[PDB]
Amino acid sequence: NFETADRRKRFWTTQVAACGQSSDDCGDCARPGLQLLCNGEGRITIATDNYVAGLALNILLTDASKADTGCGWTPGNRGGFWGDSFRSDNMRSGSKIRQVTARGSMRETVALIRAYAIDDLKKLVAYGVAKSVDVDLTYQGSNKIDMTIMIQGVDGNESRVGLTGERIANAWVWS
Amino acid sequence: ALSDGFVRLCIDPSLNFFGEGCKILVEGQITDDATAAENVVTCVNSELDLVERFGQGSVLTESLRKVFCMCKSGVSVYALPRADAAAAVSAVYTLTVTGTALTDGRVQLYMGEAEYSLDIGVDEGDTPTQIAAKIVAAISPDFPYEATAAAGVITLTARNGGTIGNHLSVIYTNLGSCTSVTPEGVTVAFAQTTPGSVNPEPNDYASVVNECCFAVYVLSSDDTDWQENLRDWIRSAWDCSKPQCFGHGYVFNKGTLGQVLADGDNSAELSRLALPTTYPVLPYLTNAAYGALSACSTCENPELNVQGQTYGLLSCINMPESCTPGWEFTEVTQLQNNGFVVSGPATTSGQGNFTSPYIYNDVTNYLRDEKNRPNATFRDASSRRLAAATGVALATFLQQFNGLAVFTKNTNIKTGIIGTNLRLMLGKIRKWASDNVGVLFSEFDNINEDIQLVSDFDVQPKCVGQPGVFHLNMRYRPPVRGARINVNLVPALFDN
Amino acid sequence: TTYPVLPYLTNAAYGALSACSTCENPELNVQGQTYGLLSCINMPESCTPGWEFTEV
Amino acid sequence: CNKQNGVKNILITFTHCDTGEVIGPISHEQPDDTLPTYKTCAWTNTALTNGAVMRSASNATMTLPVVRDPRVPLAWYQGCAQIDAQVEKFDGTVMTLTEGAVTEPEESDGRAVTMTIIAAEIDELLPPGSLAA
DSSP states (O other): OOSOOOOOOOOOOOBTTTTOEEEOSSOEEEOOBOOEEEEBTEEEEEOOOOHHHHHHHHHHSSBOOOOOOSSOOOGGGOOSOGGGGSOOSSOOOSBOTTOOOOOSSHHHHHHHHHHHHHHHHTHHHHHTSOSEEEEEEEEOSSSOEEEEEEEEOOOSSOOOOOOSSOOOSSGGGOO | OOSOOSSOOOOOOSOOOOOOSOEEEEEEEOOTTOOSOTTOOEEOOOGGGTTTTTOSSOHHHHHHHHHHHHOSSSOEEEEEEEOOOTTOOOOEEEEEEESOBOSOOEEEEBOSSGGGOEEEEOOSSSBOTTTSOTHHHHSOTTSSEEEOOOSSEEEEEESSOSTTSOOOOOBOOOOSSOSSOOOTTOEEEEEEEEOOOOOOOOOOHHHHSTTOOOSEEEEOOOOHHHHHHHHHHHHHHTOSSSOOOOOEEEEEEESOHHHHHHHOOSOTTEEEEEEOTTOSSOHHHHHHHHHHIIIIISTTSTTOOOOHHHHSBOTTOOEEOOSSOSSOHHHHHHHHHTTOBOEEESSOOOTTSEEOEEESOOBOSOOBOTTSOBOOTTOBHHHHHHHHHHHHHHHHHHGGGTTOEEOOSSOOOOTTOBEEOHHHHHHHHHHHHHHTBTTTBOOOSOTTTSEEEEEGGGTSOTTTSOTTOEEEEEOOOOOOOOOOOOOOOOOOSSOO | OOOSSOHHHHHHHHHHIIIIISTTSTTOOOOTTTTTOOTTOOOOOOSSOSSOTTTO | OOSOOOEEEEEEOOBOTTTOOBOOOEEOOOSSSOOOEEEOOOSEEEEOGGGOEEEEOOOEEEEEEEEOOTTSOHHHHTTSSBEEEEEEESSSOEEEEEEEEEOSOOOOOSSEEEEEEEESOOEEEOOSSOSOO
8 A cells, every 4th residue: 555554643742932932131931832723714723743842841841749858748739740640651750850959059059950850851762752862051150051952863764774772662753 | 930940940942943053055046936035045944934935846946845855954054046047948848648548557757856756547448648648737736847738749848947947858667568557559759849048147146145154055057157156256265365154065067978077177165966968867956965965964073974875875866777877987987086976876776666876975176286286185075174174173272372471582481470482382282283183183294393383573574573473384184084905815735 | 334233332332341340450451252242232143244354 | 501401481270170260371480409200101011021011001190399379279289170281391392281180189388289190191392303203
């Protein structure tokens, strides 16, 4: 039959700047969300582009379960998601980059933040959407700090032979 | 953010694309319906925006389509649309269908490139030519030629004027015995009736690309004069009369061996691609693919050579296997020795089957220097990229001496002073040069003589020099690329 | 003649930078991309530099 | 004067690891009549039997006795900061070292400091007219 045999489809995906950017004296930042696409006669539809990038936003912008402390937390904000009780992959949803505390000089604290960021985004490889991820951080002074996150993708159809690693599963999103 | 968070507040810009500094400029013609302004450089975003901005089936759109299909991400694209000459003529091709189909079957054609192929089924036996020639209703809109569907003959007219629309060789793959029964009694004849006349000759590069640095220039034309103007502009970017922008250009030349050789001139600023007279694929499509692949979509590393079946594979292009190699081996060697680039099929397969082309040698059209001596200093394209990289990197390293106190005459530096003298400056530079061996240079033949530092007072005569100006002279060598070994096989019947 | 910024804004910014914020050690110059950057003035990018190198 | 054995200029450039501060190439003076000593051969030999030798890794070492600058904390001169040094002898030889580290510091009264530095390699600039490349 026709070579387009892969029938797997793609659902909605959160996108950056979907709801515009919120400006303030400090700076300008994006406001991610869902995107609406309109036809010529109404009939709005949601966008389904940049799957892996949308997935990364979900991981970063979600608080994971907080560690036990001995004094306790209010039941409302213990963190995490109640739906994780059913997943069988032996992992927990969300992230915990926001649970850092000022320790030592600012240089040390920034270093810890990078360690958490790598630890949480590492889950992308486990799911199989991406084959490798790395984050580079640069400290320039008091108020200007930058982060860059690099995610490596793959084409939908195999083209190389003799790979040291393995062909990542769930690559039908081809990114 | 508000009403959330504990310590910090992450913010990320809307732009999902990063990695600037890798810029590619594509130049070509357009059609009337294009809304883009002529002779104005504009940015290009993705394929969904094309067609409307550059016309339907225009030369520029086809070139851009391949560029985006080879550099999915990691490079920024730019377009410089042009307009047809005042009195440009449009080429016309004829394709006459004869006979009456008397058996069920299908007709399939291949023109220009695999993307434009069509396959339709003959309605039924006893369908004459008029009911045939339904091919016109099947030809894809993007094809640069317009089909009119006259009475029994279909006419193809170029959508762009000038000589650009003067290259075709159709392959009607199915005739004679075929499982998809060839409609018996149906035949097709191919012939040309009118060639192109006039090409544009823009010469305003200094005004529209005045002070923008570009990595790779791509030109979708075969006018020798137009290409010469691009070469002259590139020279100006490598000139020593002002800060340099650097860059490289890609062009193609088509014709017989005698014609192609005469088209070349000593030019390290261009990489001329040679094609034969019967190339099945449209010329400029292949040139765009080569430029886009080598437009830092892969050569972020300045020392990476775009050759071989692994790195020089133009996957985006599919063409049926030809009956003859086209470029005879005795001719392939001459083209390589003369500074041209030659491409050929990647995989050996029976004639008539589909393959992809790849590039043998990544070389520039350079054969001699200014003093008329022969050398291979700028033979490989990687040399040009490495030379630019060394210039930029070296300038950054020397930046640390800006505004630093310099002592001459009396060379003893008092205690607590922050300064340096000639000998200390030279020693520091030597350290940087040596450490880069294996990254930008090969081992120096004599590192003690290929670097020199002299103050301006020692060059100008008495009471003519300036305070705090130095002259640095350096000679280097790019990394080695290969070696030759002489082997003497010696069987020995005797022992000991 | 084609400067895209109000002239008296650039003049004040340059004067203020080299007046107090920088020149408390007179030996220092105000040049380069680090010690002479008017970070409080923003103008759009353009291909044409305004001053040709010969004019500069 | 070319046959005089002595030191002419000493330049050092600290880099505080804990805060990233960088101090320009300050000049220094030596405390007494001793001179620095150098070792620029990375590999080291050992004596086997019958003329053979074993070859080991070792490093490139330096020894720089210099008077402390009264505008720099004493800690920096010990193993709490990177060092980049250059020494220019009277004859013309210039020897440079980058990314060096101090090892096993000893107590100093406040003026005389004897640093022991180690780096991947040391580059030597012989006077004009060398023989080797």
